[PDB]
């Protein structure tokens, strides 16, 4: 009834032939890689392949956000590619957005965890002085009160009495701040530089802010973020319950669809040394895909 075309390594020319014969294939004829060119995918079939790959990639991306591993469903999506695509676009877009927001919140909350107390301390140390055009400030961390002195010594060596060095204790280190004439900011920086110290940078948006503003935004994000994350997580959960299983079934159908399309393309590209042709009557058709091999690819009809 239906024509079968099979390709594999040359190593398996014989075991392949054998297994086909005994599965019930008939009129078994070896093919030359040459004559497979005809089974070259049409522009139309290449476009289907590309769309199935996009299904694979969008479902993976969605499952990742949702926190489900890609594990082959027993009952894979059975609809058209159009149906698959129509079911997945809204879900993939929502997952993309949710996953991005959730990550931004988590990174935000962690930033506040790391730099929180430091920004509070420094802001206070620099309250009223942190956006004064005639004065320059430098926040920076220092480990020992002994090290702070060496700095105080350097600074005085360099600026006499034209600076203010104050510091607040952190859990381990000390949050320090220097204040100088704006025009001498670099002289102060140089002093830190010669002691192996540097300005404390705050990550992200906070970097380009005055201490005071930075600490205030951190304080409010610390009140708002944790609850916004809850809401994002509830949306993500809701997406899992509504669509987790469908995604898996889509992924599964699409993984196979891609293999099926590529197999044909690779075969036609003479990417295999051994290739056979044969005819399969409805009954035997069962035993043929069972001798699956895994190193070979067929295409029935």
Q: Where are the domains of the chain?
A: 1-40+270-301, 41-127+202-269, 128-201
Distance CA 267, CA 259 (A): 12
Q: Which two tokens mark 280?
A: 């399969």
Whether the domain at 41-127+202-269 and the domain at 128-201 fall into the same CATH topology = no
Report the topology of domain 128-201.
Alpha-Beta Plaits (3.30.70)
Neighbours of 252 (CB within 10 A): 20
**CATH code, 1-40+270-301:** 3.30.70.2170
Distance CA 178, CA 180 (A): 7
Backbone angles phi, psi at 158, to 5 degrees: -105, -25
Determined by X-ray
Q: Which two tokens mark 114?
A: 């790391």
Q: Which two tokens mark 30?
A: 């070896």
Q: Which residues, in sequence order, are CB contacts of 194 under 8 Å at separation 6+?
A: 154
| Structure resolution, Å | 2.6
Are residues 30 and 6 in contact, defined by beta-carbon separation less than 8 angstroms?
Answer: no
Secondary structure letter of residue 11 according to DSSP: G
- How many residues does this entry show for the chain? 301
Reduced to 3 states, what is the DSSP secondary structure of residue 49?
helix
Are residues 287 and 23 in contact, defined by beta-carbon separation less than 8 angstroms?
Answer: yes
Question: What is the longest distance spanned by two Cα atoms in the chain?
Answer: 102
Q: Residue 268: left if φ>0, alpha if ψ -120 to 50, beta else—which one? A: alpha
Report the topology of domain 41-127+202-269.
subunit c (vma5p) of the yeast v-atpase, domain 2 (1.20.1460)
């Amino acid at each position: 009834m239906e024509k079968l075309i099979v390709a594999g390594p040359k190593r398996l020319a014989r075991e392949l032939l054998a297994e086909l014969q005994k599965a019930g294939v008939v009129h078994i004829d070896p093919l030359r890689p040459d004559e497979l060119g005809e089974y070259r995918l049409s522009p139309t079939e290449e476009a289907e392949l590309k769309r199935w790959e996009a299904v694979v990639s969008q479902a993976e991306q969605s499952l990742t956000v949702v926190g489900l591993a890609t594990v082959p469903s027993s009952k894979p999506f059975t609809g058209s590619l159009e149906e698959a695509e129509a079911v997945l676009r809204p879900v993939a877009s929502r997952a993309e957005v949710l996953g991005k927001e959730r990550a931004a919140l988590e990174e935000e909350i962690q930033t506040i965890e790391l730099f929180g107390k430091a920004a509070e301390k420094l802001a206070a140390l620099a309250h009223g002085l942190d956006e004064s055009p005639r004065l320059g400030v430098i926040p920076f961390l220092v480990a020992k009160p002994e090290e702070l002195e060496a700095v105080r010594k350097a600074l005085q060596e360099a600026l006499a009495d034209r600076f203010v060095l104050e510091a607040e204790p952190l859990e381990n280190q000390l949050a320090a701040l220097v204040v100088v004439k704006r025009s001498e900011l670099e002289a102060a920086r140089s002093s830190l530089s010669r002691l192996g110290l540097a300005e404390l940078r705050f990550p992200g948006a906070y970097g380009a802010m005055p201490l005071g503003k930075a600490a205030a935004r951190m304080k409010e994000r610390a009140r708002l973020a944790p609850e916004e994350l809850v809401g994002i997580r509830e949306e993500v959960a809701r997406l899992s319950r509504e669509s987790g299983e469908a995604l898996i079934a889509l992924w599964t159908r699409a993984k196979d669809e891609v293999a099926r399309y590529k197999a044909v393309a690779d075969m036609a590209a003479g990417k295999y040394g051994a290739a056979l042709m044969g005819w399969v009557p409805q009954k035997a058709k069962g035993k043929v895909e069972e001798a699956l091999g895994r190193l070979r690819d067929q295409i029935v009809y």
